[PDB]
Paper text:
Ribose-5-phosphate isomerases catalyze the interconversion of ribulose-5-phosphate and ribose-5-phosphate as an important part of the pentose phosphate pathway. Two types of ribose-5-phosphate isomerases exist, RpiA and RpiB, which share little structural homology and have distinct active sites and mechanisms of action. Although RpiB occurs predominantly in bacteria, here we report crystal structures of a putative RpiB from the pathogenic fungus Coccidioides immitis. The C. immitis RpiB contains the canonical open (α,β) Rossman fold, a common fold for proteins that bind nucleotides or nucleotide-like molecules.
A 1.7 Å resolution structure was obtained in which the catalytic base of C. immitis RpiB, Cys76, appears to form a weakly covalent bond with the central carbon of malonic acid with a bond distance of 2.2 Å. This interaction may mimic that formed by the suicide inhibitor iodoacetic acid with RpiB. The chemical reaction of Cys76 with iodoacetate is expected to form a Cys-CH2COOH adduct. The conformation of either of the carboxylates of malonic acid may be reflective of the carboxylate of the covalent adduct formed with iodoacetate. One of the carboxylates of malonic acid forms hydrogen bonds with the backbone amides of Thr78 (conserved as a serine or threonine, 3.0 Å) and the universally conserved Gly77 (2.9 Å) as well as the side chain of the universally conserved Asp16 (2.6 Å). The hydrogen bond with Asp16 is unlikely to occur at neutral pH where both carboxylates are expected to be deprotonated and negatively charged. In contrast, the interaction is well ordered in the pH 5.0 crystal. The second malonic acid carboxylate forms hydrogen bonding interactions with the backbone amide nitrogen of the universally conserved Gly81 (2.5 Å) and with the side chain of the universally conserved Asn110' of the other protomer of the obligate dimeric enzyme (3.0 Å). The interactions of this carboxylate with RpiB may reflect the interactions formed by the iodoacetate covalent adduct. There is a chloride ion in the active site 3.7 Å away from the malonic acid and near Arg105' and Arg120, although this anion is ill-suited to mimic the iodide ion leaving group of iodoacetate because it is on the opposite side of the caboxylate relative to Cys76.
Residue numbers in the entry:
A (entry chain A), B (entry chain A): 6 to 163
Write the structure that this text describes.
Amino acid sequence: LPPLRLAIACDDAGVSYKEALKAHLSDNPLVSSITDVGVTSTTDKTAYPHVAIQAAQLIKDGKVDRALMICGTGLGVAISANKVPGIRAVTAHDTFSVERAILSNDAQVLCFGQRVIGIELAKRLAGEWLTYRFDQKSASAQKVQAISDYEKKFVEVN
Amino acid sequence: LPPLRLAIACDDAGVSYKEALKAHLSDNPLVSSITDVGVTSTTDKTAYPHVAIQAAQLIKDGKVDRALMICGTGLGVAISANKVPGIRAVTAHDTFSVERAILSNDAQVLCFGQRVIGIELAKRLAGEWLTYRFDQKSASAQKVQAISDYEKKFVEVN
Ligand SMILES: [Cl-]
Ligand SMILES: [Cl-]
Ligand SMILES: [Cl-]
Ligand SMILES: [Cl-]
């Protein structure tokens, strides 16, 4: 499989897992590059939507292929990334969900909750995530299309 | 605490859990009413984004307060609901995340994966979810505001 470009993002509550995941993934041949949008210290209290939207915008703008996002629960980063047009983001902490996030939902964003999941499970799931690639000709693509259809309702004016 | 109006939604892969959850919640004094947007049979192959967006639109339009959504993984329904302006949706399968979905993220939508979670855990989490109420004056409200700020970029033309 070809390697993918990743963005990674966290808030203050996700820093140590982010660092561990970044180290783990920097050795992986399915990762071509990692773009770290921060935060890079627990001292940085930047609110999670800013880091999530920045990382999601890198996907929309063709700079990366997927993003991995970490905060306390991984919920707010997923909500935030889903607000970006054409971006589909999940919070997932089990192997079946992570597979389906790609193969059913074509979700470019995977989010973890540092305060709820353990680091080895998170590393394992992130490694598995990279091995699935969405089939644009699948029956699932027609369901994803209904989401994209809804997104056509909106124009970005600001 | 005052009772809340709920919408409930599922696709074909979420029907039996939806029915069990609806039965469980119809006895709960924190639920004032349940609006079921379907599907109501495993024979109905309506794609999950339609049911999710319909249920999310009930919240946006002041018809219900929250929605519970069930499909195979609960991921696509969450993605879909997050596309609706002002709606914040999560997939959550643990007690800490469900609390924070409300108290941190002010998420009106909770989603479950029938194929990944068990029915008693799902019932328990849905009951707990109703007992938390977001504090609009909290520090978290300022973070949620950053999401709402981003949503201001878009106008709905169709
Ligand atoms: Cl948290
Ligand atoms: Cl797992
Ligand atoms: Cl599934
Ligand atoms: Cl739990």
